[PDB]
Amino acid sequence: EVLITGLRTRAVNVPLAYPVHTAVGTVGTAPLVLIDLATSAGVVGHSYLFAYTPVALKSLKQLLDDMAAMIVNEPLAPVSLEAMLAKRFCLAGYTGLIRMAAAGIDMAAWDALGKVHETPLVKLLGANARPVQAYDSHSLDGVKLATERAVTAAELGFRAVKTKIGYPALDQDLAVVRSIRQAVGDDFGIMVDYNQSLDVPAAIKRSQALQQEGVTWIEEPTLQHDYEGHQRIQSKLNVPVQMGENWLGPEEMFKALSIGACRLAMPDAMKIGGVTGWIRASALAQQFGIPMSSHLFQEISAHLLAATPTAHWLERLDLAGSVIEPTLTFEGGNAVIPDLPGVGIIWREKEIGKYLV
Amino acid sequence: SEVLITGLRTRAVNVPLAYPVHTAVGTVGTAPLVLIDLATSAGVVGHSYLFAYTPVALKSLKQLLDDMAAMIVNEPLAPVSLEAMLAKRFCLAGYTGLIRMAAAGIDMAAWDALGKVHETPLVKLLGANARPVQAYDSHSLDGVKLATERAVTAAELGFRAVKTKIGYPALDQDLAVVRSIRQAVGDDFGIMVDYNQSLDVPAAIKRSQALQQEGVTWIEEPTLQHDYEGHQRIQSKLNVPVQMGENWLGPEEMFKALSIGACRLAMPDAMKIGGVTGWIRASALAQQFGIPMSSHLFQEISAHLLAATPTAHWLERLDLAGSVIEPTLTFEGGNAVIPDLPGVGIIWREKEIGKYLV
Amino acid sequence: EVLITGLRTRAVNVPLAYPVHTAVGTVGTAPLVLIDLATSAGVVGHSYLFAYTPVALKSLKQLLDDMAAMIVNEPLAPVSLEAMLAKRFCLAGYTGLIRMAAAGIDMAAWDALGKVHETPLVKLLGANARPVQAYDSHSLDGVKLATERAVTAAELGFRAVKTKIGYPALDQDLAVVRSIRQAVGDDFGIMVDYNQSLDVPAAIKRSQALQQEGVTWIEEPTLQHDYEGHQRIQSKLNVPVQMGENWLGPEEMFKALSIGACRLAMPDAMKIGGVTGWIRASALAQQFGIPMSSHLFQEISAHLLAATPTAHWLERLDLAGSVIEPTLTFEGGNAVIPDLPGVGIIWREKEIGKYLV
Amino acid sequence: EVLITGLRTRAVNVPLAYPVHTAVGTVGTAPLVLIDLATSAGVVGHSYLFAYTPVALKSLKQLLDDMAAMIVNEPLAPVSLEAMLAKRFCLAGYTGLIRMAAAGIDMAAWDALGKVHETPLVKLLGANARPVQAYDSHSLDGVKLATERAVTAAELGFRAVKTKIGYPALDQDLAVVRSIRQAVGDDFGIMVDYNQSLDVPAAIKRSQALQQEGVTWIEEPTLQHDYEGHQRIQSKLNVPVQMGENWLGPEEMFKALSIGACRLAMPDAMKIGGVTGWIRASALAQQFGIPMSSHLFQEISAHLLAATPTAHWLERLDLAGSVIEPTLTFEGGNAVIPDLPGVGIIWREKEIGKYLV
């Protein structure tokens, strides 16, 4: 019926209103690959990828462009497409940039499929649209900016914020949390994120002090692939350890959950394998008893969380707002899925040319 | 005197193979390689190459490496510190896959350059005597007739073992190939077999128990490479050793596989394991877990690396880059012999490389 | 190309400015074996061994001298030499004094290889020299001397000290830590060392009390070979248990890490097997996620920690300062590797004669 | 109160009628340290140590001579003396040559204590003398000599022999076992010993072939300290894996038995820690359900096995026959304890002089 007829990618470097400072360096702009998936039915699927660093941006575009011949003239059947890519790349390594590229095609193909059936992605997945609580995602901003941004988020109606920590001293971590807490009050979430910057003993010492201060979760305290080390950290805490943005495919999530690395999970729509990977991830989170949040890609994560049995929070970090129309809205701090077929992404074509690499 | 990296040059080539590498999951008909030149303030140039597996990833890998150049040019030629830096710089994007392979290619060129700085073969720089290492001639999913011809030819060349790739539609076809080779080479000869991830766990148990009755030397990647639990289940049903490791991206994946008991043999890939720096760490693990450790591809550097490996087992002879690298590595009586050259011993065939440029 | 041509050893008993009092007895002098490895390239490798007690000093020298014929005329290839000694001693027992002797040969051979290549050992290992934070290592000194020494170390720039505890009463342990803490303030490390003197229940009781006071780590609470007992102790603590100075070879480290005996490790350059053993130990500590410190042998440990992914602290205990030129220096508490080939050891040939046994 | 009044040691290098060829090299002579423990009761305890290689011989004697100051004038209480040595050596490392030296003192002290009470050692331990089945211990002798020695062993009355294997080819291992089996018949033991020479997959392969041939046990297939690896080999076999000659102290035995490394044990009276360590090893083998044999030191092992609840075999390898009187006899292949106080060791004083080092 519906065949894939073309793939077009555009690499952009988009500035951010606030740089994403982390304990391991600053992401000052967002390197994105914008994807269009043309089909024989007249509709075009849209998705985008986040390359994290300009150093990988051109590499990821080139890879996608060389993948185009693998998918042109195949049926628009994302689950069957994913299994084909999984096999074709099983020698090179179906991980990293390659898996990220495969997820970008998956997310565009699902967008295309909802458009074919003139229906929002959440409904094509068999679920009712529902609002999801969102937290406003901040960075390693220093006490002054961290507190201003938390006040502005609370004014916009958000009920929780995330700040990135891992300053040179534990006292600086605690100063930021304490200052946010005094400005937003007790009935407010403060999630904190170390971006893999602590070894396991440091993470136990810092995390127990944060837990005494009162935080909502402690995210990626150590090396993201060290599932055992996260389990050891989690074993010393009442507060939940959060991880998942760096799981490449549901199989990595299965490994982490099988050994108890974390009491929360937050897969990333790209790295987990797109919609197809998210659905599988969501089935694991349910059976392991893990409340499941999103990481980035807030446009598509609104739909996916609505179909997730243990949906927890949506991360509001609008990486692509400069090139995507704001059809996703926030009422009372909850993300509200737009009444649009597919994901609801509409390119801001006038702005894209400003940021092309 | 301090030695600095002063340039990084890459060349993407798509190189002929006398025999296409047929596998159960598809055919590698040419070798897409990225050749790496690491210029230094000592004047010497470090050489290495990467294998992209599919032409689909070739240009992307070269592009990534060219964009990584800015991270390493004007840094000290200290491969262990360079590796720590790349690990940190890529911890958000994902220090795995193509990025990790790119980092390993830098690492292998940097260690080559450091051996050249000290005018000494890499094995001796690593603190070990050069020793010959037994090598098996590595074949593919060749069908009975060609599989048998290549095994006879390898036996005449002095090899004492061959590897064939299996996973034909029927187990009887796998068996027909292994049996035909055995009849042509005799009883005092290794036959390693390679499934390239093509079986589920119950099929792998069934096929491997039948192959075990034929006395093959090991059974390589029976199922999905990341499925360490499943490999353990397959190994639990076998006396023959399960072999894996060519797809471990970094020694951290090796550590996870060995921790669960996935395999009684290991064969890291000098590229995917993370280069010389990653190989040294992999060898330390294999030693403590009691795992005989073989190589995967990259025979030029693997001869050096195995000589430094306490549990060194076999060298895979698959000469992917022979069309563009001078044959300074030799084989005597089936054993790889390290050349008396500084660093790794790689000398480009500069007049051949231009024939294959992408 | 380069062969070992000779081995010379000298047994000394050297005075210590401060006796090393421990919970299990006093090391009042340092019995050392000083090692010279001659090569066909004109350079001489240097190392030394610490015998812990004069009772073992002459035995260790004799053993090394009887090992000379095994290594003379072998290539200067420390990794292959270690394999040869491992095999040759596999029936006698490649542990204990024999293993310590093998490590002494290894450290001198690596010094000699760096000298053949005219490069500091850290650079021959492929790493940049970097300063390494050091703690000043004290002993079971009693409240008065313990505090004085802690004050003096703080004045010299050290950011942490180690004291040895295990007085008859736990109150005496706590009185020393409290006194040191008042003199150095809260932004200062206090590591404490029991030297195997407690059983597991006593160690749980004392360690929880020291944890409440605030210490940096608790080292060797019980019998060094009792990895399961250390695991039980560590399971009851937030503060990290530290061990490793008694691991004979990385295979013993592997056993202890595999069962979770400690959250920190500190291998001893001699007992772990010299440079070759150290390299293997550091690969394990990295995969197990263990910050790795040194025990004694500060001259060579400065190089080794600079090549160690999880390098933590250097122990500053200058056992050999009376016979080795102070080319290793300390700036702001950090050990600074000297710009010398190999390890940087230069014998004080006038002083050695004063201490020969 | 009987006190120790002297400690005398003599290093000898004694001839072997048949060199002990092994897969890892040849022990052509026996380097022994002969021990005399004089007491204030006038009786003298006798024991001896085996240094395995002449390279360790003078070092072991030197260490014993320097330990003498720790034990002279102490009461003749072997269990209290062992505890003192354990503590005094806890920093240097109570293993290796130091532990072997401590065991030699322990074995002389117990022989001394038997003499004080004019009673054989077995009776002082509270057990009846009973004959213990012995196997004649051979080496890596090749097909011709291995079979000749097996014939001669059978004619002397032994009902089992041990041969050492680990020839370059598995077919050579099997050719030896097959020729011995033809010469001795089916109702006869053939123990085989690899002396650590195989990796784990090679050991699985050779052992399953030997198991098909029919052998009594498979001894030290891989590295002696690799307890996990021995467990993996044992998991693939019906035939029992045998080890223990290299355990230094019952604490190492405990670690191996705890993980299931072997279904048989054979501690070495020296390395296990003398009579004191043997008694503790016997208590462990009993609870773990492990039949327990001896390694070497046949003179004292005859007494110790008589007191061992799970006593299995005595290794007959008469390393010291050139310097000790043949008071131990063999009836029907069973070792028969002599009716003599203590261990029953009487030096051949006119012979020791020929072999002094």
Ligand SMILES: *[B@@]1([O])O[C]([O])C2=C1[C]=[C][C]=[C]2
């Ligand atoms: B951090 O992990 O939280 C944000 O989503 C983010 C982070 C790092 C880099 C970019 C974005």
Ligand SMILES: *[B@@]1([O])O[C]([O])C2=C1[C]=[C][C]=[C]2
């Ligand atoms: B196979 O795994 O063995 C060879 O090394 C090879 C394989 C697949 C693809 C290329 C080479």
Ligand SMILES: *[B@@]1([O])O[C]([O])C2=C1[C]=[C][C]=[C]2
């Ligand atoms: B103790 O463990 O710390 C010191 O390094 C030391 C110790 C005991 C004996 C000598 C030195």
Ligand SMILES: *[B@@]1([O])O[C]([O])C2=C1[C]=[C][C]=[C]2
């Ligand atoms: B072997 O393990 O059996 C014998 O007791 C023996 C061995 C090795 C070295 C000496 C004696």
Ligand SMILES: [Mg+2]
């Ligand atoms: Mg995060």
Ligand SMILES: [Mg+2]
């Ligand atoms: Mg393979």
Ligand SMILES: [Mg+2]
């Ligand atoms: Mg200590």
Ligand SMILES: [Mg+2]
């Ligand atoms: Mg034996």
